[PDB]
Subunit: 116 residues, 4 copies
Amino acid sequence: KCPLMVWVLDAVRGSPAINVAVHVFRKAADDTWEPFASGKTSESGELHGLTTEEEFVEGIYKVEIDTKSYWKALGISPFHEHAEVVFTANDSGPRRYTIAALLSPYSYSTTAVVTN
Amino acid sequence: CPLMVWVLDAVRGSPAINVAVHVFRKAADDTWEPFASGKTSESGELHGLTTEEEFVEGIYKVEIDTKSYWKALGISPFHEHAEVVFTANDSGPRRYTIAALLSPYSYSTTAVVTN
Amino acid sequence: KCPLMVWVLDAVRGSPAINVAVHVFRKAADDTWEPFASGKTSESGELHGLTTEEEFVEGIYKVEIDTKSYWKALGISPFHEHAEVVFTANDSGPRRYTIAALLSPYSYSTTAVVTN
Amino acid sequence: CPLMVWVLDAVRGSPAINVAVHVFRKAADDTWEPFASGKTSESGELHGLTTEEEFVEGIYKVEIDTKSYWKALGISPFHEHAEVVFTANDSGPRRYTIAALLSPYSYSTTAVVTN
């Protein structure tokens, strides 16, 4: 159903990271990043419905997570401007991508869960 | 130095100083016997826990006292402590660096094992 | 509903970590760890139904995740015997705990998501 | 040394050797201008990227070429590269250590900022 989902967690509060802006880009033929989809994480730290199976073709995608704005709204001084997750989407049978990001003011981790 | 612990603070972006660390070794009776202990330095490092002679094969548990660290900084954390349990020197002596990255509700640990 | 859930992900395969044994213990008055609940992660890497709101009283709990057996079944030589997550469960209004663990052969990370 | 990069391999429990790193600085026209580059050593460290004089205030992007690293090891990874984007030296000169921990489908990055 949903081919690309983003989950964001807050490692300082131990909670979902709510209202985090997320911008997805697709690399164009001229090597520039073209806006593809965007949204804000929900109360559960999830962002669903970014794209459809039809539109999400093979290509290089960048998921930018606006971490600095998130920390600033919480009164915390962070290190990063934003987190970037860059990957190739490949048709190798049925696939769904979940990008999980765990945020700390001076650190972050990201993991991809790719399922059939 | 066959066993070292390095600890970083992901909130401050700095070494985690004065973090207590207790190391245990599993005895023949399956209990955890105290093996070594210390506190991280201003660089977040803890050296000199043991010697090549004393660090024989066995199952070791490195307990990093993260709750006491966060409490001293006025932060109420989730975990009591981080626990790193591993078999050491089962294919001969190795040097181990246990790296820990701390957040109030999360931590990560990684081992760098060198021959 | 479910007060304690465990999620386990595999950072080498980018997938849920399936059939991972998980043992939960509660610290007794004599300072020993008493078995409390156990199970295996599902096809989604989740373990639900470990306990009930009635049984999950305030106390110190240890969640042991049998990572070495998981890696060995995949033909991978890991560092840790198991991962341990030790925490105090506190009544501070309605609370649900999700313990998330991300596994690599020589590293792991754990995060707690505590919600109302 | 005001900017250093340390990279670890979470699969092998070892430093990640020969990892290419490219650093960019945001120009007045909002484009990313090449700033410095290098490869991690046998210890997983990359030193000497820049000097205190050249490392002025600005927004920097440290690109760690993780896909090329995993491909050279016969592992097909998820990410193209890891990207660490930050404002540097906005309250005066600081020393930055960017630490990255790599797995085929995951990575973590942490910054240690010292004055």
